[PDB]
Design a protein around this nucleic acid. Structure first.
Lengths: 950, 577
DNA sequence: AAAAGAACGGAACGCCTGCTCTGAACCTGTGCC
């Protein structure tokens, strides 16, 4: 009924007109889908009609050319509208026609990029949402399209897969959003479009090995998702399991590990794949070079856990020695097996014995047993220039494997004796016993120096491992603690004075020390014993440990490096480091002692860093796991978060109210940053949001953060809350009064009262300390204004009223600064940079309205002429005096400085007249004389003083 | 256009390789309703003749094309319907390098579909004329006869008028044999009954004489045998002075007489086309008389064309230029003397020069052929040029303005000839040297004998500089100095730059006024003076010195002395200018 | 009269510097050492 009728209508349009009939039938389908949403026969009818229309368009491609222009015009008019499922389905269907699909794809990419940018802008500023509630999301409609076209359509699946293939490459922030959208639509169409599953898998496998140089992390992510959704898809896609290893050992950036983990079920259900990878293993491990041999050993280590350890065992008995055959390799290559052996050790018993025996042989290769003699560690073995046998990682692997072996239940007797002897040997030794006796022994860029430098790096790394092992052995054992405490005395003996070598760079690598070697569980437990570990069960070993003040400092400093490793990278060293759920529990336990120790009342300054980094991690890593932490912090998310702020506000006000003698500005800066980092996740409409604002403005307007970063840091905080809630132009106007009261006016003949509305700003804070930040907001305030003005290019009356209020109020602000004597730094430059920017935004709204008189606009112009222009030009005359006086400091080739010091001045004039020239254009076209309020554009001349040259 | 042009080479190299996808290609071409007429010709050229060429398996495309034209020759979509007959012309052209059956079937279908269509025999005959004009040379005599022998049935049956003086009927005006036959009583029957033909399509007759010229060009060397008694035909129209009563017309006969005249001058163009090149008994003389007749007829037309407020004449001053027989240069066999006739002839050639060197007939040849066409008879050009020079040495306003305009138009011709950017390409530098050889031999006693390029440059420079003495209008001075730039090198040498400075300063110091006073200050005058000043100041020796002298002597004298006139040292400079 | 035409009037993304914030052990001065 409907399909033949609309086919006849399309034939009529081919004979007649197509400008409006197309849009009419899109609208008909749109309301049909809307009424049917709250229909399989209707969906089949829709499939038939789209098939008919796409065949007709393919027959006459030029007929559909008007669709591109029509949709572009609609998108220019409608802010994100007209991108209905019908329209996008028609667009993708003709893309399969292969005619002009590139331009359609480019238009789609531009539209989605604009859509995600607009979504981010609206999310990051509610002030635009109130005046622009037309939040149109292309992602929502395109993801609903998957379900809409999941009823056996002619070419919807092909269009969607082509769209996703273009999307994934377009992704390469907006790029991350595009990649996420493409991956989601591919997953949805794989879970929906059954008959294209094999073709999709083959195509993505062809693409998966398509960017060797470029990152393909999104590719492996999507492949893993589709494989875990359909485990047997690649089984039906056979003859590719062998093929996928063509150039796998070229660029391991964790891509190889991800590929192996994604395909692991296939290997465990596909013996041919296992055999082929075994065959490739011989070539990979025997590669004489070391450029890419790391990927091979990493993949083999992962495979060891990939295959089950139930108990053919002959498979394992064969593959045990494969990696050991490459043990004599480069130190960097030898590194990864030590870190990775523990993971596979929890999957077998006999394999554990074999690995322990091999590691025993390796450690005995360097042990050098003796009694009451030189340090057993033959540090000179790895001296040569470079090193080929890391020791700290090996010892950490030794202790972890020993712990797991003991827990699961003579090499183990040899292990404990060797561990006990070397620990006893270390305490029964000193720097004199080691090769490094004197402080002036080794120097950087010296053959003896770098050798001793490597030795120093190794030995203190060894000390950390023995610290961890004895703690597990010494369950409330004072003798083991005495060995532990004495061992640390050797550790810092190398440090402090001869730390690393010396390191004159005033930098603190790894929080304070090089990369630690402590399992996260141990350091978590050590602090709990070290802090809050009060009980009669302890034998004063904690107390003497507490006596070692440097042990306190080192106790948390390692964890601070550890969390920073998890802060930047998504993983960390130590057992269970890359397991997030295991790490999350560790993250829950550690934070309590760090916070409590600070509240006990330097050392506490460390805990401030530790907390500030732990929040910044989980808010950026454990997005879904926040409720678990909040439950462990002890859906009232805002209640407890505000409670912690209250405990922190008391410390700050007490510190801020105290005299400058006891200031510790480093803590105060941290006290402010933690507020900002903890203010990110308050309730958007919470009362505590308003309550926190009411307190901070009181403190800012009352207290005087004379410290540089303290004033800057606190002012940064208040705006982050005062952006998503309101506009700050009232505050900026108020602050502009104080700086105007702080100094003298440009006119040099007018005085002002104290008018100290805010105590944060004072005479000593007249620097860019404040007048650069507020101008940054002035940059942001105008930055978002352009977005709506561009959109502005029924409620438009409200749109124009709001802009003229913010711009008009901001216009008064600039008038206040422009009469003051701004500091001669870059703040003079930046003021002229935004002043040039401000006039430009004044244009595009007027430039828009040309294509459309109100007196409200005139009153803004009247205020603009009266309070801005003559002052600005007079302010320009001020700059001449300032630069001339400032240029006297020329050590008592100034060509470079003079040009820069006056570079914004010409472009200030040009931005004045380009607005003026179009404002001239408006006046004639608008039939109104707007120039009576304003003033003739003044200009300046010069004169060379010939007499002064003598 | 480039895609079709390369497709020509692709089908030429491997016809089977192209016709492999030729099914889809032809389906797309037929389906695509949007196609430029030139693109229509390009596609149909092979789309209609692939079967005749590739006789093995090409019959499918030919059958599809014949079916679609049969459904569209009588179809209700005249827009692009003539594309079918265009493809027919392409088919005969391919056959004009058996197949007669397909052409006969197509012609029968066209005739059936155009039984009563007015613009059917018109456009069909236009297509045949284009055929033989462009690519009909290799056409067999039998094929050409079968295509276009309907002249013996159409022309003498109802379009060949009778020479008897008994013409009478319900005509708006009486029939008078304007421009009667030169040979009285030799062939009385030689006349054309125009008024009976209008009141048998008057629109259709104008593009016919071309076709009989084309027939006699293949059935004989010349047109004398077929049109011996018809070359000197008069026109059956009202009295020539009858146009004087334009007010007396009042559309009672004004429109009818306007159509009469409009068909008349186009018929004169047709006969001058068909019976010009051949030399026979008074053939070239009668051609000259026809030229004088058409000039006088157009002059008479001008009056009623101004009197007629609006018109929509059928194409088969300058505003009516599109609705005219755009006669090519093939008529110029007697180029080597009515000054008005010269003005009109070189006005006809000037527009073509401005278009091709900067509407199907002039576009049919490349500029390489334009060069040979223009150099075919450069000798009469220089002869008339020196005649006008001698007249100006001797020096009626009604004649003086005529010579002035002819002068200007001739210099326009040489400037748009030699300022051609195609001379930058050296693909025909020998042709340029040969073209300049006649001018070089005209300056010197002659016998260039492979003259040197620099010698030719200097000789042509001096020869064209000879005209720098006497010049009637400033626009002529502009075009003279610009053609003098055009022949010489782009960057002038020192001697030529000094000559440029001297001549341009002399022209600046010259005084220009129309024959009846009335200084020639106008609009084109402004651009002409702009170009003069640009080239002079560019080619001066001391540019700063020259501008200082101008702004320090010429302007002050104008501001001080001149009230409504020019400046004393620079009569070209004016307050308005 | 103040209308076109197209030659005149005009716009966007890309670039690494000459930039200023940041950096660093110092060397000075003076109550302490």
């Amino acid at each position: 009924e409907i399909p033949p009728l609309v086919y006849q209508l399309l034939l009529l349009s081919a004979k007649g007109s197509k400008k409006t009939v197309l849009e009419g039938i899109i609208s008909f389908f749109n309301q049909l889908d809307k009424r049917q949403k709250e229909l399989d026969q209707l969906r089949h009818v829709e499939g038939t009609v789209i098939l008919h229309i796409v065949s007709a368009i393919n027959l006459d491609q030029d007929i559909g050319e008007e669709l591109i222009k029509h949709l572009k015009t609609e998108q220019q008019k409608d802010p994100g509208k007209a991108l209905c499922p019908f329209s996008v389905s028609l667009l993708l269907s003709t893309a399969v026609k292969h005619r002009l699909q590139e331009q359609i794809f480019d238009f789609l990419k531009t539209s989605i990029t604009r859509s995600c940018k607009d979504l981010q802008i609206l999310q990051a500023s509610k002030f635009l949402q109130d005046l622009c509630p037309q939040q149109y999301d292309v992602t929502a409609v395109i993801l609903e399209v998957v379900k809409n076209s999941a009823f056996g359509w002619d070419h919807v699946t092909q269009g969607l897969v082509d769209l996703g293939f273009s999307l994934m490459e377009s992704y390469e922030m907006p790029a991350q959003q595009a990649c996420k959208l493409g991956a989601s639509i591919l997953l949805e169409t794989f879970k929906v479009h059954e008959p294209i599953r094999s073709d999709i898998l083959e195509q993505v496998l062809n693409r998966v090995l398509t960017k060797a140089a470029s990152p393909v992390s999104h590719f492996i992510d999507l492949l893993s998702n589709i494989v875990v959704s359909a485990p047997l898809v690649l089984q039906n896609s056979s003859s590719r399991v062998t093929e996928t290893f063509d150039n796998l050992s070229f660029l391991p950036i964790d891509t190889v590990q991800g590929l192996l983990r994604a395909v692991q079920p296939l290997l465990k259900v596909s013996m041919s794949v296992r055999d082929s990878l075994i065959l490739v293993l011989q070539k990979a491990i025997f590669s004489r070079q070391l450029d890419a041999r790391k990927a091979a050993v990493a993949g083999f280590l992962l495979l060891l856990r990939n295959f089950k350890i139930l108990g053919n065992e002959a498979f394992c008995l064969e593959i045990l020695g494969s990696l050991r055959r490459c043990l004599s390799q480069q130190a960097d290559v030898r590194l990864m097996l030590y870190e990775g052996f523990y993971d596979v050790l929890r999957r077998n018993s006999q394999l554990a014995s074999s690995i322990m025996e091999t590691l025993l042989s390796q450690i005995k290769q360097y042990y050098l047993p003796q009694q009451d003699l030189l340090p057993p560690l033959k540090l000179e073995g790895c001296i040569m220039i470079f090193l080929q046998e890391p020791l700290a990682h090996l010892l950490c692997c030794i202790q972890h494997c020993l712990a797991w072996y003991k827990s699961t239940v003579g090499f183990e007797q040899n292990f404990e004796e060797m561990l006990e002897s070397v620990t006893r040997r270390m305490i029964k030794s000193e720097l004199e016993d080691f090769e490094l006796d004197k402080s002036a022994d080794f120097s950087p860029s010296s053959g003896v120096g770098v050798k001793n430098n490597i030795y120093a790096i190794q030995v203190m790394g060894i000390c950390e491992v023995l610290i961890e092992y004895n703690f597990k052995i010494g369950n409330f054992s004072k003798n083991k603690f005495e060995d532990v405490l004495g061992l640390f005395t050797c550790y810092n003996k190398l440090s402090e004075i001869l730390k690393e070598k010396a390191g004159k760079n005033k930098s603190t690598l790894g929080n304070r020390i090089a990369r630690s070697f402590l399992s996260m569980g141990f350091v978590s437990t050590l602090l709990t014993a070290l802090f809050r570990d009060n009980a009669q069960s302890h034998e004063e070993s904690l107390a003497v440990l507490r006596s070692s003040t440097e042990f306190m400092r080192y106790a948390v400093s390692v964890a601070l490096q550890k969390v920073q490793q998890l802060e930047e990278m998504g993983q960390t060293d130590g057992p269970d480091g890359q397991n997030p759920e295991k790490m999350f529990q560790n993250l829950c336990k550690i934070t309590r002692v760090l916070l409590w120790r600070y509240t006990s009342i330097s050392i506490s300054l460390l805990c401030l860093e530790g907390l500030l980094r732990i929040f910044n991690t989980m808010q950026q890593l454990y997005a879904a796991r926040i409720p678990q932490f909040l439950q462990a912090l002890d859906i009232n998310v805002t209640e407890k978060a505000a409670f912690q702020i209250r405990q922190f506000q008391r410390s700050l006000v007490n510190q801020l109210s105290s005299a400058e003698d006891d200031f510790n500005s480093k803590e105060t800066q941290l006290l402010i940053t933690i507020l900002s980092t903890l203010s990110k996740l308050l309730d958007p409409g919470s009362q505590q949001f308003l309550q926190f604002l009411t307190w901070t403005v009181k403190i800012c307007k009352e207290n005087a953060l004379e410290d540089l970063s303290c004033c800057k840091g606190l002012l940064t905080l208040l705006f982050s809350l005062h952006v998503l809630y309101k506009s700050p132009v009232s505050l900026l106007r108020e602050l502009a009064q104080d700086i105007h009261a702080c100094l003298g006016d440009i006119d040099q003949d007018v005085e002002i009262e104290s008018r100290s509305h805010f105590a944060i700003v004072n005479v000593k804070t007249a620097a860019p300390t404040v007048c650069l930040l507020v101008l940054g907001q002035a940059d942001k305030v105008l930055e978002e204004v352009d977005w709506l003005i561009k959109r502005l290019t029924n409620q438009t009356q409200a749109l124009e009223k709001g802009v003229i209020l913010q711009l008009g109020t901001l216009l008064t602000v600039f008038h206040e600064l422009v009469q003051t004597a701004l500091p001669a730094g870059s703040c003079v430059d930046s003021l002229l940079r935004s002043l040039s920017k401000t006039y430009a935004i004044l244009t595009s709204l007027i430039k828009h309205y040309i294509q459309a008189v109100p007196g409200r606009l005139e009153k803004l112009v009247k205020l603009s002429g009266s309070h801005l222009t003559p002052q600005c030009y007079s302010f320009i005359t001020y700059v001449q005096n300032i630069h001339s006086e400032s240029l006297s400091f020329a050590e008592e080739t100034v060509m470079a400085k003079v040009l820069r010091d006056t570079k914004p001045i010409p472009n200030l004039i040009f931005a004045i007249e380009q607005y003026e020239k179009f404002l001239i254009h408006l006046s004639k076209k608008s039939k109104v004389n707007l120039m009576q309020y304003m003033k003739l554009s003044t200009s300046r001349d010069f004169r060379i003083n010939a007499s002064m040259l003598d | 256009d480039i895609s079709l042009d390369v497709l020509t080479d692709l089908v030429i190299l491997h016809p089977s390789l192209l016709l492999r996808y030729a099914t889809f290609v032809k389906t797309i071409l037929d389906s695509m309703q949007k196609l430029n007429p030139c693109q229509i010709r390009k596609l149909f050229y092979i789309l209609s003749t692939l079967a005749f060429s590739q006789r093995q398996e090409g019959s499918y495309i030919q059958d599809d094309m014949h079916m679609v034209i049969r459904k569209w020759l009588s179809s209700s979509v005249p827009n692009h319907k003539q594309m079918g007959i265009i493809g027919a012309v392409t088919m005969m052209g391919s056959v004009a390098l058996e197949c007669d059956g397909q052409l006969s079937t197509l012609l029968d279908l066209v005739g059936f579909c155009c039984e009563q269509t007015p613009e059917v025999l018109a456009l069909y005959y236009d297509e045949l004329a284009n055929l033989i004009e462009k690519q009909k040379g290799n056409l067999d005599l039998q094929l050409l006869d079968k295509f276009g022998k309907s002249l013996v049935e159409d022309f003498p049956n109802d379009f060949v008028v009778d020479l008897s003086p008994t013409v009478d009927g319900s005509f708006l005006f009486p029939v008078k044999s304007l421009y009667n036959l030169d040979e009285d009583e030799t062939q009385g029957a030689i006349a054309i009954n125009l008024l009976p033909l209008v009141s048998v399509s008057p629109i259709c007759l104008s593009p016919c004489f071309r076709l009989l010229r084309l027939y006699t060009g293949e059935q004989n060397n010349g047109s004398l045998e077929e049109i011996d008694a018809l070359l000197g035909c008069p026109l059956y129209l009202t009295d020539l002075e009858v146009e004087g009563k334009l007010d007396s017309l009042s559309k009672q006969e004004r429109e009818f007489l306007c159509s009469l005249l409009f068909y008349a001058l186009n018929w004169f163009r047709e006969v001058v086309n068909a019976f010009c090149q051949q030399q026979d008994a008074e053939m070239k003389g009668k051609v000259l008389t026809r030229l004088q007749n058409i000039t006088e007829l157009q002059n008479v037309l001008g009056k009623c064309l101004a009197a007629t407020p609006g018109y929509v004449p059928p194409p088969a001053l300058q505003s009516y230029r599109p609705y005219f027989r755009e006669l090519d240069l093939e008529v110029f066999s007697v180029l080597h003397l009515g000054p008005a006739e010269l003005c009109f002839l070189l006005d006809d050639m000037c527009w073509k020069l401005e278009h091709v060197l900067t509407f199907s007939h002039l576009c049919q040849r490349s500029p390489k052929e334009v060069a040979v066409c223009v150099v075919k008879l450069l000798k009469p050009l220089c002869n008339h040029m020196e005649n006008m020079h001698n007249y100006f040495q001797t020096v009626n306003i009604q004649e003086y303005q005529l010579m002035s305009s002819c002068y200007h138009q001739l210099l326009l011709a040489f400037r748009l000839l030699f300022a051609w950017s195609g001379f930058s390409q050296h693909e025909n530098s020998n042709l340029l040297r040969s073209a300049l050889q006649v001018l070089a031999d005209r300056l010197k006693p002659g016998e260039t004998e492979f003259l040197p390029l620099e010698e030719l440059i200097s000789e042509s420079f001096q020869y064209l500089l000879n005209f720098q003495a006497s010049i009637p209008s400033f626009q002529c001075a502009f075009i003279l100095t610009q053609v003098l730039m055009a022949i010489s090198e782009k960057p002038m040498t020192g001697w030529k730059r000094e000559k440029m400075a001297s001549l341009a300063k002399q022209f600046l110091c010259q005084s220009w006024m129309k024959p009846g006073g009335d200084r020639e200050k106008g609009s084109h005058f402004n651009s002409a003076l702009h170009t003069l000043l640009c080239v002079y100041l560019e080619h001066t020796d001391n540019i700063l010195k020259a501008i200082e002298e101008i702004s320090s002597v010429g302007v002050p004298e104008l501001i001080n002395s001149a009230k409504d006139g020019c400046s004393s040292t620079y009569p070209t400079l004016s307050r308005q200018t």
